[PDB]
Amino acid sequence: YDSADCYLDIQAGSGGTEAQDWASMLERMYLRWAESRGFKTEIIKESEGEVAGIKSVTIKISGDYAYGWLRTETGVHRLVRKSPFDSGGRRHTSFSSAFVYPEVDDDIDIEINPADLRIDVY
Amino acid sequence: EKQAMEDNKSDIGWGSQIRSYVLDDSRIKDLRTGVETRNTQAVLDGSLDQFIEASLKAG
RNA sequence: GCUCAACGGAUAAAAGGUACUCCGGGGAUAACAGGCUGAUACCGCCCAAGAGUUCAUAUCGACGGCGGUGUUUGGCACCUCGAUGUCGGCUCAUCACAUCCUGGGGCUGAAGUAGGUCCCAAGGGUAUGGCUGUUCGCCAUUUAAAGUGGUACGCGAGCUGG
RNA sequence: AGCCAGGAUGUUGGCUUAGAAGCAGCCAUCAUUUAAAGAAAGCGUAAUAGCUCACUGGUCGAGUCGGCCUGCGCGGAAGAU
RNA sequence: GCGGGGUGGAGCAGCCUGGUAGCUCGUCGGGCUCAUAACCCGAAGGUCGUCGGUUCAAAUCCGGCCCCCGCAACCA
RNA sequence: UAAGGAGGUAUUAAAUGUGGGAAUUC
RNA sequence: CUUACCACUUUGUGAUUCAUGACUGGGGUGAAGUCGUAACAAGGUAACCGUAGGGGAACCUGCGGUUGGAUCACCUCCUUA
RNA sequence: AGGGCUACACACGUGCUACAAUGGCGCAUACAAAGAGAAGCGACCUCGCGAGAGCAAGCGGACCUCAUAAAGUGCGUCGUAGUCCGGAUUGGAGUCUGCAACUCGACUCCAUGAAGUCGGAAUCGCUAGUAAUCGUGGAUCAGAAUGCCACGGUGAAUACGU
RNA sequence: GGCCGCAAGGUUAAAACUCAAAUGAAUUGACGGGGGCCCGCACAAGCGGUGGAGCAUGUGGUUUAAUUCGAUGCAACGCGAAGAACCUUACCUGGUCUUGACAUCCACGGAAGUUUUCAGAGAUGAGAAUGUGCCUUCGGGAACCGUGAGACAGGUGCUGCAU
RNA sequence: CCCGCAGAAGAAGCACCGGCUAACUCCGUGCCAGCAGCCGCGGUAAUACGGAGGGUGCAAGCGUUAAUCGGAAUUACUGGGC
Ligand SMILES: [K+]
Ligand SMILES: [K+]
Ligand SMILES: [K+]
Ligand SMILES: [K+]
Ligand SMILES: [K+]
Ligand SMILES: [K+]
Ligand SMILES: [K+]
Ligand SMILES: [K+]
Ligand SMILES: [K+]
Ligand SMILES: [K+]
Ligand SMILES: [K+]
Ligand SMILES: [K+]
Ligand SMILES: [K+]
Ligand SMILES: [K+]
Ligand SMILES: [K+]
Ligand SMILES: [K+]
Ligand SMILES: [K+]
Ligand SMILES: [K+]
Ligand SMILES: [K+]
Ligand SMILES: [K+]
Ligand SMILES: [K+]
Ligand SMILES: [K+]
Ligand SMILES: [K+]
Ligand SMILES: [K+]
Ligand SMILES: [K+]
Ligand SMILES: [K+]
Ligand SMILES: [K+]
Ligand SMILES: [Mg+2]
Ligand SMILES: [Mg+2]
Ligand SMILES: [Mg+2]
Ligand SMILES: [Mg+2]
Ligand SMILES: [Mg+2]
Ligand SMILES: [Mg+2]
Ligand SMILES: [Mg+2]
Ligand SMILES: [Mg+2]
Ligand SMILES: [Mg+2]
Ligand SMILES: [Mg+2]
Ligand SMILES: [Mg+2]
Ligand SMILES: [Mg+2]
Ligand SMILES: [Mg+2]
């Protein structure tokens, strides 16, 4: 399926609001990389964190071997910095997950073969 | 099958990480391949080709 | 002067229940069974795209076509409404063959064993239980096999009556 | 009709294929040796191979071929006292 | 068989009676706040299920088709 | 100046703040 | 030989204990989720205790009780020394 | 070396200029302070509508230059109009600095003549020579200020009170 | 589980599991929609503005080969920058160098220079004229240009959460 | 048990070093790998992880685990509280 188009889901994790901000940063990064590669992107959906960032986002990536190029990015991404939310500005850690799955064609409907059925009337 | 994928998905927690982006040390390291860079700004702007190509080459 | 529109307009003025029922009629008319039909149902055949590594026809067979049976669900309303009692079970059956087993054969993608498929063949044979009123069906365990049907979906002036 | 010879060459035409030699296809499908011999009609080989065959020669010596119209028949064609 | 519906992202109006799309939330921009919510000031967004007809003109009237609802489906 | 009694005062509104701190100490 | 006692063994009905059981009750825990904000300041309706009713939840309300509750300033008038 | 730092659907902060008549325009005419200057300030005179150019004094400065302050005052006009308000934008023609003004300078002349008619929620500064308004100079600097730093002119309102 | 109760419930009364604390009083602060007393253009009283327009300028965002880097509640945003056409410039594209643009040392050469020519966008490369001086035990040396090494140079690269 | 023979010849390891607790530095590592009796250590300048050098304590043993008592006056008779 490396040649297929793909979907990229970003979800915030342990950092809370910091993780949501980190997820938004990851979304921006991935969109920029897709633009560099010339793929076409469309936000399928995007849940936004209330204080900041996004809780989650699903993005559709279209192009030549988009799933091949993106599949290795599946995993959790750890971010370490000075929390721009903590009043004390302590050095915190936040986590965000990126999951890439290929676009799948809908299953062709199959008529129930009458030879496969036994009918009883009573 | 979808539920199996969800169960397989790594918990988004303190131990599970494929790439670490430490800005204070200005270092970014991919745990799987070992590829490390110092241009955090470029990577956050979208210079992921280094890590992606390294992962594909590693297979 | 009437949507007396149920429009040749019953009265100026009117809706329902009856399994508590009743009378006069109708096989002019329904429910069961018979009849006609055969859409449907079931069983065949014709063509051969294709499946079958190759190979349409070992086995299947798309898109389409032609029949058989009466055999499901029907159509009709010819018999019976001065009465033709019904589902299942029980007892006893009898015929068909479109054969389940046993018998004979052809082809096989039939090494043997064991099968597939078709042809001939109706002599005999062709379960016991769990559940359910059940037919059907599923399940357990057998058997060479646990056939498919007709007989008023056989059989209550034979029984039962869930 | 049988029957007897034959039934060649470039060349396995090349590609795609796993292999592809007439005979999976795709894909061209020519010229040469001439009596004639198909870049193959079929069988067949994993592929070849092999078996034919189309074609053509030679012996035997009168028909032979396959369409059209039409008459009558044959199969398709299984049911319950 | 007989009735209803299908309209900004959601829920409801507008149909009857042809000319005109409204309300509440939601979205977007600016405020307030250390920041978010709340709050305040502004904006945007539906060519009306889908086709067709009729009409000068159709969300509206008519007819299909699709989806959704209700009822009805009896004696037998 | 001190003591006692009485009357008036007054905000309607205002929810929330994740997860990585202390050398300074013979 | 017989009787008495009596071991094995047999039957019925209880008790207790261990394991287990579709489902179900609450409990503890958690480097992030949802809903509020119950308490700590008078925590913005003082809190808490017993009891009763109610409610997504912390809780709310009634009745009685406890202090293990904060504040108690200021202006005007009158009287007395 | 050339390009970018000057991009441009958009959002915010800080400014300048306005929306006019307590004003615009034309003519005339008063009153400052502070400061800079030698690869500098540059007078005068002549040429040019103008930005400027040519020639050329003086001054390392209480001496010379930058360098007429403007608001004001007097007269005239405009007569409430998107105007004789506003001056963005754009076309043409130039000047200067600088090797070099395309990207991307400042200024001048001509033509052009946008929004804007006093600004929603909200929000800022200031208690006296202050606010408001009017000019002037400086650094940085080859050239390039609505910014910054500084200097004078005119010159208020109000403060009951906590 | 037992006992009591009509019930609500009361009474008696565990264990597993989990934590390294829970707790009392007092102390210093900080905080309070607690109290008191004061003050500040904090209100109040006024005057003029901002938010609307055009333009300037900075920022964000977006764009871009690059749109260099920082500042980024009050206390960033006409801020570092008291002044980006080139230079600046730290960025990009392309062309170039490798002890080197900027130093010291060693060796070896050449005064310093000056003027040219050509080619290149320029860096630079190649060539041609012209001076060959100053101290100076004719040992020279060193102002200065190169060439060859290697100790080194060089970085507006990272960390203001080491300073 | 004694005498003779030969040559230093045949004979040293284990735990630990942040505090408690005797014993400290370098490198590796970078909330990972790991340590941990308690408090805890590790997130790029670790005496706490791992190696090394050095050191400390025991020694033909040294550590870990299991178990009892002590410390625990933490069931208090000795000898506690409300
Ligand atoms: K009538
Ligand atoms: K009736
Ligand atoms: K009844
Ligand atoms: K019958
Ligand atoms: K018939
Ligand atoms: K028929
Ligand atoms: K009858
Ligand atoms: K048989
Ligand atoms: K057979
Ligand atoms: K038979
Ligand atoms: K049934
Ligand atoms: K029968
Ligand atoms: K009878
Ligand atoms: K349970
Ligand atoms: K309360
Ligand atoms: K309280
Ligand atoms: K509820
Ligand atoms: K400005
Ligand atoms: K005008
Ligand atoms: K200047
Ligand atoms: K009761
Ligand atoms: K206080
Ligand atoms: K402004
Ligand atoms: K320029
Ligand atoms: K500092
Ligand atoms: K290191
Ligand atoms: K005692
Ligand atoms: Mg009539
Ligand atoms: Mg009854
Ligand atoms: Mg009755
Ligand atoms: Mg009757
Ligand atoms: Mg009749
Ligand atoms: Mg009938
Ligand atoms: Mg019938
Ligand atoms: Mg008739
Ligand atoms: Mg009859
Ligand atoms: Mg009769
Ligand atoms: Mg037969
Ligand atoms: Mg017979
Ligand atoms: Mg016989």
Ligand SMILES: [Mg+2]
């Ligand atoms: Mg039964």
Ligand SMILES: [Mg+2]
């Ligand atoms: Mg029948």
Ligand SMILES: [Mg+2]
């Ligand atoms: Mg029967």
Ligand SMILES: [Mg+2]
């Ligand atoms: Mg019968």
Ligand SMILES: [Mg+2]
């Ligand atoms: Mg009978």
Ligand SMILES: [Mg+2]
């Ligand atoms: Mg009965």
Ligand SMILES: [Mg+2]
């Ligand atoms: Mg016939």
Ligand SMILES: [Mg+2]
């Ligand atoms: Mg309309």
Ligand SMILES: [Mg+2]
């Ligand atoms: Mg009935």
Ligand SMILES: [Mg+2]
């Ligand atoms: Mg919340």
Ligand SMILES: [Mg+2]
């Ligand atoms: Mg907190």
Ligand SMILES: [Mg+2]
């Ligand atoms: Mg509260």
Ligand SMILES: [Mg+2]
């Ligand atoms: Mg309270």
Ligand SMILES: [Mg+2]
């Ligand atoms: Mg209540």
Ligand SMILES: [Mg+2]
């Ligand atoms: Mg700039």
Ligand SMILES: [Mg+2]
């Ligand atoms: Mg100057």
